[PDB]
Amino acid sequence: KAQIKQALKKLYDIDTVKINTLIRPDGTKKAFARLTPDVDALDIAATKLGLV
Amino acid sequence: NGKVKAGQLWSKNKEELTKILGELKTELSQLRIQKISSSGAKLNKIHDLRKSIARVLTVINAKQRAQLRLFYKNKKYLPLDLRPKLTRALRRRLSKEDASRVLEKTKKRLTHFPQRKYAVKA
Amino acid sequence: PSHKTFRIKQKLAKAQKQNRPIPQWIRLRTGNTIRYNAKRRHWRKTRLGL
Amino acid sequence: KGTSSFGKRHNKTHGLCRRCGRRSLHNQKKVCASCGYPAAKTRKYNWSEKAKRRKVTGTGRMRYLSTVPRRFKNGFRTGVPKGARG
RNA sequence: AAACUUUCAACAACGGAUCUCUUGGUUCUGGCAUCGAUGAAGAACGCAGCGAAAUGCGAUAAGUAAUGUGAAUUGCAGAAUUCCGUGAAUCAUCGAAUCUUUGAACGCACAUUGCGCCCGCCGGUAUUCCGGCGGGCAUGCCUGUUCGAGCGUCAU
RNA sequence: GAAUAAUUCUCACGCCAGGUCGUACUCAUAACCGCAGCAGGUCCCCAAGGUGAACAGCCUCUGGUUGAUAGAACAAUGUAG
RNA sequence: GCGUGAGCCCGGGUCGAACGGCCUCUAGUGCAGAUCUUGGUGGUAGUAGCAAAUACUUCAAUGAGAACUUGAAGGACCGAAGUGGGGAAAGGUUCCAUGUGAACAGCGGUUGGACAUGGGUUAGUCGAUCCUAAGCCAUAGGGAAGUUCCGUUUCAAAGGGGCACUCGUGCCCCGUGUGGCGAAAGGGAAGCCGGUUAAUAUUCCGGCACCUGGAUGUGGGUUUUGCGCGGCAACGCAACUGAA
RNA sequence: AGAGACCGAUAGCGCACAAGUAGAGUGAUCGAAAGAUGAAAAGCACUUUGAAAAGAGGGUUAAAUAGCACGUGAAAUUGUU
RNA sequence: UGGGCGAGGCUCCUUCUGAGUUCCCUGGAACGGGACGCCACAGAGGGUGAGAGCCCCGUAUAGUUGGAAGCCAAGCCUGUGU
RNA sequence: GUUGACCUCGGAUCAGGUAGGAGGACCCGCUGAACUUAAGCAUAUCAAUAAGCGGAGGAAAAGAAACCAACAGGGAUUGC
Numbered sequence A: 001k002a003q004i005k006q007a008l009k010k011l012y013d014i015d016t017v018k019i020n021t022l023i024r025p026d027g028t029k030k031a032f033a034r035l036t037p038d039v040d041a042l043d044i045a046a047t048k049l050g051l052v
Numbered sequence B: 001n002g003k004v005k006a007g008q009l010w011s012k013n014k015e016e017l018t019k020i021l022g023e024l025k026t027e028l029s030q031l032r033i034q035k036i037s038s039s040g041a042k043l044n045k046i047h048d049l050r051k052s053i054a055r056v057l058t059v060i061n062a063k064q065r066a067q068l069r070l071f072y073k074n075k076k077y078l079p080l081d082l083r084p085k086l087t088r089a090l091r092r093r094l095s096k097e098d099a100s101r102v103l104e105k106t107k108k109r110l111t112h113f114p115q116r117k118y119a120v121k122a
Numbered sequence C: 001p002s003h004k005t006f007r008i009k010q011k012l013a014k015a016q017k018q019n020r021p022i023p024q025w026i027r028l029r030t031g032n033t034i035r036y037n038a039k040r041r042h043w044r045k046t047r048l049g050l
Numbered sequence D: 001k002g003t004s005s006f007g008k009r010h011n012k013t014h015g016l017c018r019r020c021g022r023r024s025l026h027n028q029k030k031v032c033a034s035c036g037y038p039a040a041k042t043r044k045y046n047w048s049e050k051a052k053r054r055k056v057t058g059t060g061r062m063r064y065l066s067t068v069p070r071r072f073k074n075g076f077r078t079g080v081p082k083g084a085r086g
Numbered sequence E: 001a002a003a004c005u006u007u008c009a010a011c012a013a014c015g016g017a018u019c020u021c022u023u024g025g026u027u028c029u030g031g032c033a034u035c036g037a038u039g040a041a042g043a044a045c046g047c048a049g050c051g052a053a054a055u056g057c058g059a060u061a062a063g064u065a066a067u068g069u070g071a072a073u074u075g076c077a078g079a080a081u082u083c084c085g086u087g088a089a090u091c092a093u094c095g096a097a098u099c100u101u102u103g104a105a106c107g108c109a110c111a112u113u114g115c116g117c118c119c120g121c122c123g124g125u126a127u128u129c130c131g132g133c134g135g136g137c138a139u140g141c142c143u144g145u146u147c148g149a150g151c152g153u154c155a156u
Numbered sequence F: 001g002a003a004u005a006a007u008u009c010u011c012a013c014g015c016c017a018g019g020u021c022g023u024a025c026u027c028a029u030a031a032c033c034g035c036a037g038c039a040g041g042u043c044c045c046c047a048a049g050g051u052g053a054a055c056a057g058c059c060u061c062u063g064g065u066u067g068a069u070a071g072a073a074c075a076a077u078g079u080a081g
Numbered sequence G: 001g002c003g004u005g006a007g008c009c010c011g012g013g014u015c016g017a018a019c020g021g022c023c024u025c026u027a028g029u030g031c032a033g034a035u036c037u038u039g040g041u042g043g044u045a046g047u048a049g050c051a052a053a054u055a056c057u058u059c060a061a062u063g064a065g066a067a068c069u070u071g072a073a074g075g076a077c078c079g080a081a082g083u084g085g086g087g088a089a090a091g092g093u094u095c096c097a098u099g100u101g102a103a104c105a106g107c108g109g110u111u112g113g114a115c116a117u118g119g120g121u122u123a124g125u126c127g128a129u130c131c132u133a134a135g136c137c138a139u140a141g142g143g144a145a146g147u148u149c150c151g152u153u154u155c156a157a158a159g160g161g162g163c164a165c166u167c168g169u170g171c172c173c174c175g176u177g178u179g180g181c182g183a184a185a186g187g188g189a190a191g192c193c194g195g196u197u198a199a200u201a202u203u204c205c206g207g208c209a210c211c212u213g214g215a216u217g218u219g220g221g222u223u224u225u226g227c228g229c230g231g232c233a234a235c236g237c238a239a240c241u242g243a244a
Numbered sequence H: 001a002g003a004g005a006c007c008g009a010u011a012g013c014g015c016a017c018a019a020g021u022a023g024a025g026u027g028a029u030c031g032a033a034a035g036a037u038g039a040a041a042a043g044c045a046c047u048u049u050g051a052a053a054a055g056a057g058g059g060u061u062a063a064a065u066a067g068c069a070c071g072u073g074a075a076a077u078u079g080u081u
Numbered sequence I: 001u002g003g004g005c006g007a008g009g010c011u012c013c014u015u016c017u018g019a020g021u022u023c024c025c026u027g028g029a030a031c032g033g034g035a036c037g038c039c040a041c042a043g044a045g046g047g048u049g050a051g052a053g054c055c056c057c058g059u060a061u062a063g064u065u066g067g068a069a070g071c072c073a074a075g076c077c078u079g080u081g082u
Numbered sequence J: 001g002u003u004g005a006c007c008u009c010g011g012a013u014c015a016g017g018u019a020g021g022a023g024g025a026c027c028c029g030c031u032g033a034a035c036u037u038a039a040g041c042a043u044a045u046c047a048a049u050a051a052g053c054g055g056a057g058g059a060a061a062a063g064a065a066a067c068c069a070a071c072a073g074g075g076a077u078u079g080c
């Protein structure tokens, strides 16, 4: 979790409040990231090329 | 875009080699973001970009090794990876000068009575 | 059981991963003889050794 | 004995071994019944010729030993061919 | 007289013998001497535009550099090159690199992705606490260096 | 360790942080072991109303099933009552 | 058609690439049996049989096709040491949605734990991680030609605590003792309610709390009799120095 | 690397094929079956019956008496005449 | 009785090598049958729609283009007695 | 007394080094059976062999006489 939080700030300049992780049955890792209340996440998904 | 030809990569310095690697790593991740739910000519770019990073990486490593070998010339001890690797058995044989030494009394006989060149007639 | 270990957890992922049929375009190559997957494993038929 | 006594079987004598990958590691003894772990030697006996061939050299990847014959043929040389660029 | 049982022929069934074939075996003769702490043999997990296996490779991952040849690959698509030169290919050769977790396996352990110490850099008010990155810490023995023990022992 | 402040006050309030792996579903007259969707075997928790000495036997409420190849006839000989 | 005989030759049909006569040489050279070896097929035969655990019925819908698919209405069983609601060992995707020709579900099948394509398991507080038990294995040493056997404090020079230096490299104390592994049922710091998804929650959202470790400021307390007062007492209060 | 008075898919090594594979056993270990369309897929357009699988016409080919259950197709056993 | 030169030869890899698609018949296709020719220090073997010396890869003979590293050695040039 | 030597025995993450494992067809050693034959069986035979253990190379091992001989004397080792 410590490395994941660092990566997002350096690469998408977005801040988070907490991260939760799990390991899927196929063997890959999935992480949920929650953003600070003042920042909006819906627009960041659009502007950071995420499909919307 | 296109390939990064290895021809012009050799005439560069370390810093600008590191710089070009910066953008190269960038859009590869960025293009992987939108590869989902779509497929076209952009799929040729991932195979294009993946190999392009490989070429510049080898050039940087190769350039470092050549300059490092120059530093350790005329030195008794040099790092393990820069030492020649032939074979475990071949690295422990006696050197040529050591296996060719002879005693003083043996050399005295060999100097005065060597093998001669002769022929016998019928 | 619900209590597992990472080694057993890792081992079960691969066993499930290599359990799907062959793609269709394989049988259309030249000089091909493969007909079907011959290493099919089913949880009610064969017991994999952990 | 029989079917009635076969239902009481829910334990494990052996587990996975770290050196050979077979499920032949005695849990209580902590020694492998196939490769002899943790002993330095690997188990091997002459009264079974089939067992020796199942794990003899050449049944795996041979990551390093496969390229030696090509290197000997050229005399274990180093360098680059004459006027190569670089 | 039909039905039923049995024998033979024609055609149609079940089954895979016979004849012909072979990128496979077997035996003899001839040439050579090359694993590993500079991490071997073996094991595990991963990598393709569309892949499960086999084959190949290791986060530089169905390959990279360099030399030669001189226009492909092919199941589909896409582009790439087009020989000016800036060069196709699952090509041939091979002298420079990368090389995850393990294994004689080496910080202590392992039925655990467990628990420590030393040195340096960057952050949070920080020589002591927390996080990230890089380099180290197994045993026997040989030569030398250095610091020591003993009324064993010599001279003031 | 103080006389003009100091304080090693276990009192009240206030600032920062807390890494790694497991978590789906069955646990059995169909998901485990007996060659199988086998009348066998396999460790624990919770425990309503009536009769009654009672976790005995018989009927009911919450909750759960209506699943075990079927239709027609009623000779001998059988298994169970 | 020929020959006493083992056998040889020809006519007709099918098929598609190699094959004979004569004299010598050579051998893994001739089958009905061995409860012979491997593969294939019959009579028995549409026969034995598919009978434990009380039991089914009416209408409508879907569909090529309904006793064993779905809805409603009747009739029944299990009867809290349950055919209910949750776990340990073991299994490993069997969980959820959509669709479906063959095969399987010892009758059927539109249904399924089967087939095909997608989705699903979030923790400072629940466990592992820490400690030892029966027990196992290194170290000092002794046996054995050797793979190795014994030995666990034993005939061992076996450890750990503080300070200051520009800077690590300089000082000063104590010393009987000095390893690791081993429990999801033993010992153990800390979280509750309401809602939410087709499929997860003491984890997600909302509200209200707690524990450990590390830094620091205000309020109050104590002190010029330097380290607090009260009650006869059992004792009391928001604090109220304490190394070997 | 070169050869044979050697074997020719029940033979020759256990393996001419994704063979030390699939599979069995707690374990040491045990361990198979499976080669051949045609010179070239030219692997049957279109119409019609059927819920569908498929059938009847019509096509490719020297040949479909070669249709992915595919060269040649014997005996045991079976159907029609 | 020291030192230094050294032609020339031998190992390895790589460039190149002779002759019919002439005419007629059968056949889906001549690599079959008939007639007429050529090459051969090359009539070993394989492919190409059926048995191919002359369609293609190769095969026999000495040479030839280019390159790398070790050997052997004909014969020459120079010091000298502590 | 102070100080300086010698001998023996130790510490160190001191500087530089070296051994383990694989393979084992052939080769150098140790250890060591029984089935079988003798028409029974115990010495004997199978056999100074199979299994077990240690150590090397492209070959290994052996080897320049405390030898053979009795002759008019031969002259390291290995193989046919």
Ligand SMILES: [Zn+2]
Residues within 6 Å of the ligand: D017, D018, D019, D020, D021, D022, D024, D032, D033, D034, D035, D036, D037
């Ligand atoms: Zn093992």
